[PDB]
């Protein structure tokens, strides 16, 4: 799995749901770099 | 070569990366199934991965993209979840372990809602959930996202149907 030619990633915009934001991809792992590590709880709704 | 540096919760810098995660929960049309169910978090920790070499890699690739489009690396800060996260953050992103075809073929990704990154920390649509009690919805036990820094140069824009 590679870029689409012309291209250094994809954008996965969601065309239904006008709330959901946008996923995206790389494929060369020195595109990124993970900068922050957090760890967290969800949390029970009250 | 990745240290670990905690950030205390008044550090402005602490502050602003929790804003980012707590500000991009979305519902998600499994009702939770995945990532459970909840519509914040309560941030435990957050660490600055500090490694010298992944960043000398990244930068020189940012650099190679920039060259490519315009002067523009179009450089994103992102969520990312999945059961790979202690090792990413020792080896960095490796494309060769991201070979399973989600949505958007293979390849790694990334969020801009912190809940969607959160439906993938124990595995494809929530695995088993947690280790300790199989739990999706677990509210015990301790999960953790990684925020990145993303080069996307000239992305391929691709509507999805969701
Ligand atoms: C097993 O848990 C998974 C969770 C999410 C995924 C999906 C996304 N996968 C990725 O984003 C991804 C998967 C694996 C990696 N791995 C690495 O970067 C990596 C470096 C070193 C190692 C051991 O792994 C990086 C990213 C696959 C496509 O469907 C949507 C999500 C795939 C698997
Ligand atoms: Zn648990």
Not at chain 1, 14 to 40: D, F, H, K, M
Not at chain 2, 63 to 92: C, D, Q, T, W, Y
Request: charged share 20%; net charge neutral; with cysteine.
């Amino acid at each position: 799995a590679h870029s689409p030619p012309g291209h250094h990633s994809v954008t996965g915009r969601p065309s239904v749901n006008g709330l959901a934001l946008a996923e995206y991809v790389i494929y060369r792992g020195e595109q990124a770099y993970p900068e922050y590590l957090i760890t967290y709880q969800i949390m029970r709704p009250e | 070569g990745t240290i670990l540096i905690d950030l205390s919760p008044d550090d402005k810098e602490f502050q602003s990366v929790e804003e980012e995660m707590q500000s991009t929960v979305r519902e998600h049309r499994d009702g939770g199934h995945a990532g459970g169910i909840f519509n914040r978090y309560n941030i435990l920790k957050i660490q600055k991965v500090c490694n010298k070499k992944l960043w000398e890699r990244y930068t020189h690739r940012r650099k190679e993209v920039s060259e490519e489009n315009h002067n523009h690396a179009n450089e994103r800060m992102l969520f990312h979840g999945s059961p790979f996260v202690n090792a990413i953050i020792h080896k960095g992103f490796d494309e060769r372990h991201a070979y399973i075809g989600g949505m958007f073929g293979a390849g790694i990704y990334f969020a801009e809602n912190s809940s969607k990154s959160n439906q993938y920390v124990y595995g494809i649509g929530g695995g088993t959930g947690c280790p300790v009690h199989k739990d999706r919805s677990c509210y015990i036990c301790h999960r953790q996202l990684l925020f990145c820094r993303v080069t996307l140069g000239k992305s391929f824009l691709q509507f999805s149907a969701m």
